[PDB]
């Protein structure tokens, strides 16, 4: 905590970021280097919660997660400073972007990156807990990054139960947590399924038309999205396999990573 621990005079605030809550395009004066600023404003969020936050990330190591710069954490405002992704998040990317460029193979190479970096997530005992497209930042060469959060400390063999009335991403979120508000790294496996999903279509939303109120009510009668046009029949079965009832009998991210890896050098 010491030797991350920065004065907020080696950061000067550039421009503000608005979907993610108070983060800003700031510069670290000594390196010239951009960087991105999560700062603590107006309680938003709670300062225990923040400062776990910040103690958790610096133990994240690992090229396919936002890596931690320093943190301001003595005097308010406190800050957290991360590395800057050139182009933003994966849903904008890739809806904006030349999918003669970004084509099947960069497709594949970013799923490589994701469940890579979930394959260490669930190596190191922590989960997600909001895996999806939107989070996910793209840097130059088609580099993804799965975003720090917002981690949570559990064992391989533990389930994360939910505060009450707590609201989740019911598109993404995994029928054991829409029911009975209990996460798991198979939660979170069930949520790379929609991502993965997510850059098959290239930035469509989930579910389309499909009412939120009868998702569940859909999902427990063994309805899934159908396989996205142009998408590889491997691809949409590592979906599907994703999209499993039973946590249990969902892959685990590292069966999940050697897949994709198997599919990306094969191509
Ligand atoms: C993980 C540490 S943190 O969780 O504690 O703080 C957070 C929280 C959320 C973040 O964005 C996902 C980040 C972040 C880190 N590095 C980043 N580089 C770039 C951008 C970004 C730049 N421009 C446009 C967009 C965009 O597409 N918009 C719709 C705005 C996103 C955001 C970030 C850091």
């Given at each position: 905590?010491?030797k991350?621990?920065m004065?907020?005079?080696?950061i000067?605030?550039?421009?503000?970021?608005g979907?993610?809550?108070?983060?800003?395009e700031?510069?670290?004066?000594?390196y010239?280097?951009?960087?991105?600023?999560?700062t603590?404003?107006e309680?938003?969020?709670?300062?225990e919660?923040?400062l776990?936050?910040?103690?958790?990330?610096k133990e994240?190591?690992?090229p396919?997660?936002?890596?931690?710069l320093?943190?301001?954490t003595?005097?308010?405002?406190?800050?957290?400073?991360?590395?800057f992704?050139?182009?933003?998040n994966?849903?904008?990317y890739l809806?904006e972007?030349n999918?003669?460029?970004?084509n099947?193979?960069?497709?594949?190479?970013?799923?490589?990156?994701?469940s890579?970096a979930?394959?260490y997530?669930?190596?190191?005992?922590?989960?997600?807990?909001?895996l999806?497209?939107?989070?996910?930042?793209?840097?130059?060469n088609?580099?993804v990054?799965?975003?720090?959060?917002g981690?949570s400390?559990?064992?391989?063999?533990?389930?994360?139960?939910?505060?009450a009335?707590?609201?989740?991403?019911?598109?993404w979120?995994?029928?054991?947590?829409?029911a009975?508000?209990?996460?798991?790294?198979?939660?979170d496996?069930?949520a790379?399924?929609?991502?993965?999903?997510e850059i098959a279509?290239?930035?469509?939303?989930?579910y389309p038309?499909?009412?939120?109120?009868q998702?569940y009510?859909?999902?427990?009668?063994?309805?899934?999205?159908?396989r996205?046009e142009?998408?590889p029949?491997?691809?949409?079965?590592?979906?599907?396999?994703?999209?499993?009832?039973?946590?249990?009998?969902?892959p685990?991210?590292?069966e999940?990573h050697?897949?994709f890896?198997?599919?990306?050098?094969?191509?």
């Open positions: 905590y010491d991350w621990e004065e907020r005079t080696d000067t605030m550039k421009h503000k970021l979907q993610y809550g108070e983060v800003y700031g510069v670290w004066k000594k010239s280097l951009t960087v991105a600023v999560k603590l404003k309680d938003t969020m709670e300062v919660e923040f776990k936050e910040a103690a958790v990330m994240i190591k690992h396919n997660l936002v890596q931690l320093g943190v301001c003595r005097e308010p405002p406190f800050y957290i400073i991360t590395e992704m050139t182009y933003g994966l849903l904008d809806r972007c999918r003669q460029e970004v099947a193979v960069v497709l594949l190479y970013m799923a490589t990156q994701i890579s979930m394959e997530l669930e190596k190191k005992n922590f989960i997600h807990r909001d999806a497209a939107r989070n996910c930042l793209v840097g130059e088609h580099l990054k799965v975003a720090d959060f981690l400390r559990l064992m391989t063999g533990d389930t994360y139960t939910a505060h009335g707590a609201k989740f991403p019911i598109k979120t995994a029928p054991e947590s829409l009975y508000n209990k996460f798991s790294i198979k939660s496996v069930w790379f399924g929609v991502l993965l999903w279509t290239y930035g469509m939303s989930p038309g499909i009412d939120l109120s998702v009510e859909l999902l427990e009668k063994d309805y899934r999205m159908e996205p142009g998408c029949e491997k691809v949409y079965e590592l979906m599907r396999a994703c999209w499993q009832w039973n946590p249990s009998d969902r685990s991210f590292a999940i050697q897949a890896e198997t599919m990306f050098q094969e191509s």
